Structure formats: C-alpha cells, structure tokens
Write an enzyme that holds these catalytic residues in place. Sequence first.
Site, PDB file in Angstrom:
ATOM      1  N   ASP A  56       0.843  -1.234   0.000  1.00 59.00           N
ATOM      2  CA  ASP A  56       0.000   0.000   0.000  1.00 59.00           C
ATOM      3  C   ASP A  56       0.863   1.263   0.000  1.00 59.00           C
ATOM      4  O   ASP A  56       1.334   1.660   1.070  1.00 59.00           O
ATOM      5  CB  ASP A  56      -0.923  -0.014   1.227  1.00 59.00           C
ATOM      6  CG  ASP A  56      -1.910   1.126   1.230  1.00 59.00           C
ATOM      7  OD1 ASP A  56      -1.757   2.018   0.405  1.00 59.00           O
ATOM      8  OD2 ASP A  56      -2.816   1.085   2.088  1.00 59.00           O
ATOM      9  N   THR A  57       1.091   1.857  -1.195  1.00 60.38           N
ATOM     10  CA  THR A  57       1.965   3.044  -1.253  1.00 60.38           C
ATOM     11  C   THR A  57       1.301   4.257  -0.601  1.00 60.38           C
ATOM     12  O   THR A  57       1.977   5.267  -0.365  1.00 60.38           O
ATOM     13  CB  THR A  57       2.366   3.375  -2.694  1.00 60.38           C
ATOM     14  OG1 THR A  57       1.162   3.571  -3.440  1.00 60.38           O
ATOM     15  CG2 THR A  57       3.149   2.234  -3.285  1.00 60.38           C
ATOM     16  N   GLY A  58      -0.013   4.164  -0.340  1.00 58.17           N
ATOM     17  CA  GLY A  58      -0.713   5.293   0.310  1.00 58.17           C
ATOM     18  C   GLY A  58      -0.606   5.286   1.814  1.00 58.17           C
ATOM     19  O   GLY A  58      -1.087   6.210   2.493  1.00 58.17           O
TER      20      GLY A  58
HETATM   21  C1  O33 Z   1      -1.156   3.481   8.122  1.00 50.46           C
HETATM   22  S1  O33 Z   1      -2.868   3.368   7.699  1.00 50.46           S
HETATM   23  C2  O33 Z   1      -3.284   5.094   7.662  1.00 50.46           C
HETATM   24  C3  O33 Z   1      -2.929   5.620   6.261  1.00 50.46           C
HETATM   25  N1  O33 Z   1      -2.804   7.067   6.330  1.00 50.46           N
HETATM   26  C4  O33 Z   1      -1.654   7.641   5.948  1.00 50.46           C
HETATM   27  O1  O33 Z   1      -0.689   7.031   5.534  1.00 50.46           O
HETATM   28  C5  O33 Z   1      -1.556   9.155   6.006  1.00 50.46           C
HETATM   29  O2  O33 Z   1      -2.789   9.749   6.384  1.00 50.46           O
HETATM   30  C6  O33 Z   1      -2.932  11.113   6.318  1.00 50.46           C
HETATM   31  C7  O33 Z   1      -1.971  11.918   5.696  1.00 50.46           C
HETATM   32  C8  O33 Z   1      -2.151  13.314   5.657  1.00 50.46           C
HETATM   33  C9  O33 Z   1      -3.288  13.893   6.230  1.00 50.46           C
HETATM   34  C10 O33 Z   1      -4.249  13.070   6.840  1.00 50.46           C
HETATM   35  C11 O33 Z   1      -5.393  13.617   7.423  1.00 50.46           C
HETATM   36  N2  O33 Z   1      -6.299  12.816   8.010  1.00 50.46           N
HETATM   37  C12 O33 Z   1      -6.151  11.489   8.056  1.00 50.46           C
HETATM   38  C13 O33 Z   1      -5.037  10.870   7.477  1.00 50.46           C
HETATM   39  C14 O33 Z   1      -4.073  11.678   6.879  1.00 50.46           C
HETATM   40  C15 O33 Z   1      -3.987   5.190   5.288  1.00 50.46           C
HETATM   41  O3  O33 Z   1      -5.044   4.702   5.696  1.00 50.46           O
HETATM   42  N3  O33 Z   1      -3.696   5.395   3.995  1.00 50.46           N
HETATM   43  C16 O33 Z   1      -4.685   5.033   2.985  1.00 50.46           C
HETATM   44  C17 O33 Z   1      -4.756   6.179   1.965  1.00 50.46           C
HETATM   45  C18 O33 Z   1      -5.058   7.457   2.722  1.00 50.46           C
HETATM   46  C19 O33 Z   1      -4.063   8.433   2.803  1.00 50.46           C
HETATM   47  C20 O33 Z   1      -4.322   9.591   3.514  1.00 50.46           C
HETATM   48  C21 O33 Z   1      -5.575   9.779   4.091  1.00 50.46           C
HETATM   49  C22 O33 Z   1      -6.589   8.831   4.001  1.00 50.46           C
HETATM   50  C23 O33 Z   1      -6.325   7.650   3.296  1.00 50.46           C
HETATM   51  C24 O33 Z   1      -4.190   3.715   2.400  1.00 50.46           C
HETATM   52  O4  O33 Z   1      -3.159   3.973   1.431  1.00 50.46           O
HETATM   53  C25 O33 Z   1      -5.342   3.018   1.739  1.00 50.46           C
HETATM   54  O5  O33 Z   1      -5.669   3.334   0.621  1.00 50.46           O
HETATM   55  N4  O33 Z   1      -5.980   2.091   2.433  1.00 50.46           N
HETATM   56  C26 O33 Z   1      -5.693   1.701   3.814  1.00 50.46           C
HETATM   57  S2  O33 Z   1      -7.023   0.668   4.290  1.00 50.46           S
HETATM   58  C27 O33 Z   1      -7.312   0.108   2.612  1.00 50.46           C
HETATM   59  C28 O33 Z   1      -8.695  -0.536   2.472  1.00 50.46           C
HETATM   60  C29 O33 Z   1      -6.298  -0.959   2.181  1.00 50.46           C
HETATM   61  C30 O33 Z   1      -7.051   1.361   1.760  1.00 50.46           C
HETATM   62  C31 O33 Z   1      -8.340   2.139   1.539  1.00 50.46           C
HETATM   63  O6  O33 Z   1      -8.756   3.008   2.356  1.00 50.46           O
HETATM   64  N5  O33 Z   1      -8.978   1.778   0.418  1.00 50.46           N
HETATM   65  C32 O33 Z   1     -10.286   2.331   0.059  1.00 50.46           C
HETATM   66  C33 O33 Z   1     -10.346   3.515  -0.822  1.00 50.46           C
HETATM   67  C34 O33 Z   1      -9.540   4.657  -0.748  1.00 50.46           C
HETATM   68  C35 O33 Z   1      -9.772   5.696  -1.659  1.00 50.46           C
HETATM   69  C36 O33 Z   1     -10.775   5.541  -2.627  1.00 50.46           C
HETATM   70  C37 O33 Z   1     -11.589   4.402  -2.669  1.00 50.46           C
HETATM   71  C38 O33 Z   1     -11.346   3.394  -1.740  1.00 50.46           C
HETATM   72  C39 O33 Z   1     -12.064   2.069  -1.606  1.00 50.46           C
HETATM   73  C40 O33 Z   1     -11.079   1.284  -0.741  1.00 50.46           C
HETATM   74  O7  O33 Z   1     -10.178   0.556  -1.589  1.00 50.46           O
END
Ligand code: O33
Lengths: 99, 99
Positions: free
Chosen positions: B25-27
């Site tokens: 997960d690069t995000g």
């Molecule tokens: C260590 S886990 C926490 C991680 N957050 C981060 O690295 C950094 O967060 C932040 C950075 C900067 C400001 C922020 C402010 N408020 C909250 C978080 C912040 C994180 O959850 N990152 C997620 C992306 C993200 C980055 C920043 C904010 C919010 C989200 C991750 O890469 C992802 O996609 N994940 C982690 S859980 C997962 C299910 C594997 C997936 C997901 O949510 N996927 C969903 C998604 C995302 C966007 C669009 C659609 C969908 C569907 C589903 O596929």
Amino acid sequence: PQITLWKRPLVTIKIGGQLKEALLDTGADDTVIEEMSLPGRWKPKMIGGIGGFIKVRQYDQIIIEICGHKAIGTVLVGPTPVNIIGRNLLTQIGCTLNF
Amino acid sequence: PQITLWKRPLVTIKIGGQLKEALLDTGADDTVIEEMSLPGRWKPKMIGGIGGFIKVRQYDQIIIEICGHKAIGTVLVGPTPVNIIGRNLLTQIGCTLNF
Ligand SMILES: CSC[C@H](NC(=O)COc1cccc2cnccc12)C(=O)N[C@@H](Cc1ccccc1)[C@H](O)C(=O)N1CSC(C)(C)[C@H]1C(=O)N[C@H]1c2ccccc2C[C@H]1O
C-alpha cells in the site's frame, strides 16, 4: 519515471480544469478527490478504509492527466483527507510496483 | 517481481512464524496488521485513513518477510480492515513505483 517511497508519492494532476496534488495509492481500489465540480451524472457510493466509511459522489468517464499521462475513468468526489489516485487510474498510466 | 495493479496487490507475508495475506500500500505511511500477538513492549499510536482515526499498538524491530523478502521494522497492530504493508517496509524491500 521511477518513484521511490521514502516520502509520500505525491504528484500533480489535472482534473476538471483544476490542478491538484494527489497521492499515488496502490491500496485504493478507486480514485477519490476532495470536493469539486465535475460534469455529468453521478450516483452516491460508500467507500471504506482505516477509520471506516465515507459517502462520496461517483462520476464516470472523467478525463484526468497524471504526471503528463492522460487517462479516463471513474472519479469519486467527497470528504477525503487527501486526494487519492487509485488502481482504476494507476493501471491506465502503466504504473506498476517493482522490487 | 513486477506487480501490476489490475487486481489488488495482495502478497503473502510471514510474521510470528505464520503466513498471512497483506496489501502492498503506497498510500500508507506505516504497516498495520490485524490483532495478533507480538513480542516486547508497545507504544501508543493513532493513524488516520479515509474514514477517520483508529488507535493501534506500535511494536518496533519486528521481523517480517514480505513476498519472501526479509524486513525488520515497525509493525502496528489494530482494527485495520486489511493487513497493510506501508512505506516503512516497502522501502526496506526496495519497492518503487514505475511508469
Ligand atoms: C497506516 S494506515 C493510515 C494511512 N494514512 C496515511 O498514511 C496518512 O494519512 C494522512 C496523511 C495526511 C493527512 C491526513 C489527514 N487525516 C487522516 C489521514 C491523513 C492510510 O489509511 N492510507 C490510505 C490512503 C489514505 C491516505 C491519507 C488519508 C486517508 C487515506 C491507504 O493507502 C489506503 O488506501 N488504504 C488503507 S485501508 C485500505 C482498504 C487498504 C485502503 C483504503 O482506504 N482503500 C479504500 C479507498 C480509498 C480511496 C478511494 C476508494 C477506496 C475504496 C477502498 O479501496
């Protein structure tokens, strides 16, 4: 280009005639952008990840330019904390993970 | 390997002698795994994603194999929806994005 992961992989995108910063996110199925206007019909959708779900508007057949590469696909719009480019568009620009 | 993004980039990891599935997960800044037992002391951490924030336990210097590549570093444990390998370990295994 080759993008390392020492820092967040942020890029400039062009969408709806606007420039935005967005994160190249291989963990996201879909692409979600903070509130903005987009043309055409939309339908509501829930998307989930860490922290739970949020409600977004789903727009189809939207053109985006991501690091100079044009693509078309569905874009979700809603209260995401970060603009995210998900797999649905990463594939179109030929992005892969390599190690 | 080269991993394309038409499907979720799920891989097998080994942690605590057990095989689990996880998402590259690069995000994600950090690596977060579903509830399990890890050795040593932990410290508190809050991580935020698309739906808000969750509390997790931070363990440092944990041995973990990702797609057969050996890493040693920080693993968070908590109520994540999916085991996530984030940038802290993707850098250890030499992972990059390429297009
Ligand atoms: C260590 S886990 C926490 C991680 N957050 C981060 O690295 C950094 O967060 C932040 C950075 C900067 C400001 C922020 C402010 N408020 C909250 C978080 C912040 C994180 O959850 N990152 C997620 C992306 C993200 C980055 C920043 C904010 C919010 C989200 C991750 O890469 C992802 O996609 N994940 C982690 S859980 C997962 C299910 C594997 C997936 C997901 O949510 N996927 C969903 C998604 C995302 C966007 C669009 C659609 C969908 C569907 C589903 O596929």
